[PDB]
A paper describes a structure:
Type IV pili (T4P)1 are long, surface-exposed filaments which extend from the surfaces of bacterial cells. T4P are composed of both major and minor pilin components, although major pilins comprise the majority of the pilin subunits within each fibre. We identified a cluster of type IV pilin-like genes within the [name] HB8 genome, using the program PilFind. Three of the remaining six, TTHA1218, [name] and TTHA1222, yielded crystals of truncated forms which enabled us to solve their structures (designated here as Tt121836-123, Tt121933-236 and Tt122238-123).
Tt121933-236 crystallized in two different crystal forms; the higher resolution form, at 1.85 Å resolution in spacegroup P21, has four molecules in the asymmetric unit, arranged as a dimer of dimers. The interfaces between monomers were analyzed by PISA, which revealed that the interface areas between chains A and B, and its equivalent between C and D, were substantial, with a mean of 1488 Å2 (the next largest interface area was 439 Å2). The CSS score for both interfaces was 1.0, suggesting that Tt121933-236 forms a dimer in solution. The monomer-monomer interface is dominated by the helix-helix interaction across the non-crystallographic 2-fold symmetry axis. The second crystal form, in spacegroup C2, has a dimer in the asymmetric unit; crucially, the interface between the A and B chain dimer is preserved in this crystal form, providing further evidence that this dimer is not a crystallization artifact. Formation of a dimer in solution by Tt121933-236 was investigated by SEC, which showed elution peaks for both monomer and dimer, as well as a third peak in the void volume, which appeared to be associated with contaminants in the preparation. Tt121933-236 forms a more complex fold topology than XcpW and the related T2SS pseudopilins, with two main differences. First, two additional β-strands, β8 and β9, are inserted into the variable β-sheet, which extend this structural feature into the same spatial location occupied by the short α2 helix in XcpW. Second, Tt121933-236 contains a long loop, from residue 184 in β10 to 221 in β11, which folds back over the external surface of the conserved sheet (marked in orange in Figs4c & d). Tt121933-236 is also stabilized by two disulphide bonds, between β2/β3, and β4/β5; both lie within the variable β-sheet.
Residue numbers in the entry:
A (entry chain B): 42 to 235
B (entry chain A): 43 to 97, 101 to 236
The structure:
């Protein structure tokens, strides 16, 4: 609980709902993961079925894309239509003001091993390549608080699934600036990529 | 602003959920319960595998209302289940949610009144094309903020008004206030 924790929970509900659908009834490129020291990027595509997803409203039987990235302390989102469309991530989700997003990490689970590396998933009639069963997403954010907060250790509040470690996620340190910090790790199943 | 961003995130969560109300459902799909003191909405839909994590071939319910300065959500499983709102979405502490309102669009006319939507194989009764949702929230801010007028920042569609929504006043208590109006299309309730 806490205002910032509640905002991170909202953010996770938005991203999880969107990413669960990636690959849905799709042939071709379904996911691209672009981890970097500056923040990770994730793009995904899926086929729209009428009635299921709001953004599909005008794209029945058509491919849609989705993308998330962090830039200048803000997590941003974009959406597009068309096979292989490049989302432009210009819609604010969280941060870039009082709230600073200090880390955004995405790892993936392939055959029981967690990885964080450049990766593209292609769905072929024979199957997915590689087979990705889940994504792990991590956010660290900070905000000012009158009187300061004690120094926060990223990773200290997480419950990891089997095989996932702070070392893989490359969690940053926290600058000694008195700000209130909160973090969130969440796992999103990706049955359409598996 | 930070509070505006928190209202945007909340709107996204609610929209994505309410858009699915009525999906492949026969029977009661939606109940709207407005009041001058705050609105409630409940809805039901069929779960199809691979649509959502929480979901196969079973009816689910979903509900929202404000209680004690928090917008809360509830869920249930089963035909006719009551989704008792039991978890905070936004507010209930530093953030206070002061108003939640839901209106509906029926044949070109925006309405806000007690209403249930029923779905039959032939179609919906009444035929609801969209919902409009409104939130007002406040937070403390060092140095205070000026007096806010609810409705003052909204872009309304034609026929939707502050009077229709029964928007409240705001006290001149120095808290920072923000509001959001958003429209959710409801094609499953329009067929």
């Amino acid at each position: 609980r806490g205002r910032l924790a509640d905002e991170l929970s909202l953010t996770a509900t938005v991203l999880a709902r969107e990413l669960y659908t990636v690959g849905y009834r799709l042939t071709g490129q379904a996911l691209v993961l672009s981890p970097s020291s500056q923040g990770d990027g994730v793009q995904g595509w899926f086929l729209c079925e009428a009635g299921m997803e709001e953004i599909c409203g005008e794209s029945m039987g058509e491919v849609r894309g989705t993308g998330y990235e962090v830039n200048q302390g803000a997590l941003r989102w974009g959406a597009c239509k068309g096979e292989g469309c490049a989302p432009l991530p210009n819609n604010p989700v969280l941060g870039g003001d009082e709230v600073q997003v200090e880390a955004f990490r995405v790892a993936y689970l392939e055959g029981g091993t967690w990885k964080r590396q450049a990766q593209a998933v292609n769905l072929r009639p024979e199957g997915a390549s590689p087979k990705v069963s889940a994504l792990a997403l991590y956010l660290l954010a900070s905000v000012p608080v009158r009187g300061g907060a004690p120094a926060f250790t990223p990773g200290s509040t997480l419950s990891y699934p089997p095989g996932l470690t702070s070392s893989l996620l490359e969690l940053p340190g926290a600058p000694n600036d008195g700000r209130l910090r909160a973090e969130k790790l969440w796992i999103v199943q990706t049955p359409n990529l598996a």
